[PDB]
Amino acid sequence: EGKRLQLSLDKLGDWEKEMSQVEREAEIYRIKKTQPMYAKRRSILKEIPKFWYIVLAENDDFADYISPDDLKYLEYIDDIYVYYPIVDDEAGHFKDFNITVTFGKNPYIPEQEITKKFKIVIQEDGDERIVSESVEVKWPHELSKINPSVIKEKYKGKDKKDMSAKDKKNYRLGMKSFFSWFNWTGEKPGKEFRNGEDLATLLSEDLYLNALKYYIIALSP
Amino acid sequence: KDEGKRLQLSLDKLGDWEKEMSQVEREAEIYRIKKTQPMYAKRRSILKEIPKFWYIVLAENDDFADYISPDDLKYLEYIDDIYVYYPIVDDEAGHFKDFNITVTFGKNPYIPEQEITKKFKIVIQEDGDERIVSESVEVKWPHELSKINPSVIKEKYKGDMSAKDKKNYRLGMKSFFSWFNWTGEKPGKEFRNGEDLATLLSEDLYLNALKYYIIALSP
Numbered sequence: 001e002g003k004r005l006q007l008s009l010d011k012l013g014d015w016e017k018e019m020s021q022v023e024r025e026a027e028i029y030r031i032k033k034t035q036p037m038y039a040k041r042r043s044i045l046k047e048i049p050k051f052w053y054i055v056l057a058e059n060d061d062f063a064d065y066i067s068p069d070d071l072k073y074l075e076y077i078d079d080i081y082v083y084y085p086i087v088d089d090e091a092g093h094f095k096d097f098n099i100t101v102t103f104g105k106n107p108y109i110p111e112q113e114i115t116k117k118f119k120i121v122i123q124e125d126g127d128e129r130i131v132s133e134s135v136e137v138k139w140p141h142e143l144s145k146i147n148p149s150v151i152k153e154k155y156k157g158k159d160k161k162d163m164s165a166k167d168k169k170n171y172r173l174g175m176k177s178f179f180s181w182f183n184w185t186g187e188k189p190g191k192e193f194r195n196g197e198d199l200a201t202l203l204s205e206d207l208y209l210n211a212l213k214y215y216i217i218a219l220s221p
Numbered sequence: 222k223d224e225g226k227r228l229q230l231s232l233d234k235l236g237d238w239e240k241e242m243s244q245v246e247r248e249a250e251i252y253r254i255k256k257t258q259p260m261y262a263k264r265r266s267i268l269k270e271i272p273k274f275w276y277i278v279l280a281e282n283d284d285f286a287d288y289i290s291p292d293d294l295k296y297l298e299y300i301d302d303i304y305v306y307y308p309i310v311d312d313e314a315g316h317f318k319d320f321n322i323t324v325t326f327g328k329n330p331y332i333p334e335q336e337i338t339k340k341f342k343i344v345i346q347e348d349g350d351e352r353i354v355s356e357s358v359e360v361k362w363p364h365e366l367s368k369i370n371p372s373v374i375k376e377k378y379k380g381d382m383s384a385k386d387k388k389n390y391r392l393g394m395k396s397f398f399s400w401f402n403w404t405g406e407k408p409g410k411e412f413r414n415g416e417d418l419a420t421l422l423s424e425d426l427y428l429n430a431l432k433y434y435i436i437a438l439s440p
């Protein structure tokens with residue numbers, strides 16, 4: 001009669017759950033097979049001088065997210081790498097990803113290696129959301145005047161609006177800088193780096209994957 | 222020239238890496254297809270239980286109705302099963318993207334019961350690219366449309382058509398049932414955008430059929 005529709009729908013629900021597990025396993029297999037190839041690519045790209053600076057400076061999508069003054073320091077990036085921790089952990093979300101930016105030896109920004117981790121959280125309304133943890137970054141020396149962290153420690157607990165005009169201008173400039181993106185979490189809206197999740201996806205899925213193409217375009221007529 | 226030769230060497234390494242990476246991605250996708258096809262077989266067995274599931278999915282979808290003549294929809298009421306099979310699983314036939322679509326017609330007075338399986342293959346274009354082609358498959362048309370069947374009219378004038386027969390040829394080439402005669406190597410003279418309809422039936426409507434069904438049965 002009509003209970004057959006209900007039984008078929010229950011079978012479909014169980015099938016959809018099993019299908020989700022199967023697709024997850026297949027995607028994790030692909031990530032595990034593809035991560036070592038990108039490790040090899042990282043090793044090769046470290047040979048090419050100023051590769052990532054050229055890729056980033058040519059890109060307009062990237063230039064929207066950063067201030068023009070920041071670009072000068074991005075010249076001293078030796079490596080951008082994306083690692084999917086599902087290869088090792090195999091216990092969380094398979095789309096979680098970590099972006100590592102390494103700055104080499106230069107007089108303008110101290111040499112360092114910054115690894116920022118991003119996780120996927122399912123919002124109550126169905127969709128996927130990117131969140132992150134703040135990672136400490138050694139800012140360029142010339143930009144220490146606009147570091148929001150220094151100004152925020154100077155105005156500890158004092159009113160959000162009772163800052164000096166100079167300090168407010170520098171705080172806004174520093175929140176517009178690329179280097180405050182490392183303090184982006186996604187759970188303090190209006191108070192963090194603007195559109196941090198979009199920049200994360202840009203660095204992990206378009207520039208990183210197609211970096212060779214953007215480089216070749218940047219060195220062609 | 223200190224860095225020119227090393228840049229060229231790095232680019233050669235990157236090219237070798239790109240070739241190996243393409244091979245790896247092909248292997249991973251073949252694994253995904255092999256692991257996912259049996260699940261879609263189980264889903265086909267379950268969906269054959271649900272009455273007029275595919276009619277609801279096809280009729281509610283606006284993307285699908287654009288590719289066909291509206292009158293064809295009347296007959297799509299009597300579709301009980303649509304299936305997609307990727308032959309890379311068993312034989313490594315050709316390109317791993319080859320796929321076969323099977324449409325089954327249930328019990329109805331208007332079009333004879335049948336099962337039509339149309340096979341699509343991928344051809345590597347001379348400039349590196351891929352192209353979709355297929356082989357013509359004979360189909361038992363609904364009775365009412367035999368007057369406009371392009372094969373019937375083409376055989377009548379096997380020698381410049383009459384106005385009625387030319388108009389019916391135009392009407393039938395726009396019909397859904399001439400899509401089974403699509404090959405992809407006769408441009409301007411075949412069914413329009415057959416590859417797009419094939420991809421829509423194989424990768425959007427078929428994969429997400431449950432979602433479109435529930436949407437079709439909601440306010």
Ligand SMILES: [Cl-]
Nearest residue numbers: 030031034084
């Ligand atoms: Cl990936």
Ligand SMILES: [Cl-]
Nearest residue numbers: 031084094095
């Ligand atoms: Cl990925």
Ligand code: NA
Nearest residue numbers: 286287288289
């Ligand atoms: Na139409």
Ligand code: NA
Nearest residue numbers: 023424428429
């Ligand atoms: Na899907």
Ligand code: NA
Nearest residue numbers: 436437439440
């Ligand atoms: Na509706």
